[PDB]
Design a protein around this ligand. Sequence first.
Ligand SMILES: [Ca+2]
Ligand SMILES: [Ca+2]
Length: 109
Amino acid sequence: MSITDVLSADDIAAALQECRDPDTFEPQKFFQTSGLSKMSANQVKDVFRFIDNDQSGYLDEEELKFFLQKFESGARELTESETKSLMAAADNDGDGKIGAEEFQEMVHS
Ligand SMILES: [Ca+2]
Ligand SMILES: [Ca+2]
């Protein structure tokens, strides 16, 4: 009850199909196709608040294991490869613990 009736529902319906295939889930591609890169920083930050359920102040990999599970039930998150493709670009450090800032950067692109 946040993103699912803003816009993103349509974008994820696209994302779902455009990255249907196993090991295809490009990060920048996803951020565009998901509308996140169209959303303003404000909205992008809000959605991140809904992402980090744990509120721990980092989007750690094993939390990222349920990133899009909050939007769809049967999202890609289970596939570590696709998850790690997201992680890989999101993590503008080379550490793997992704801050909201890091995500805002990658999405803002
Ligand atoms: Ca967290
Ligand atoms: Ca990082």
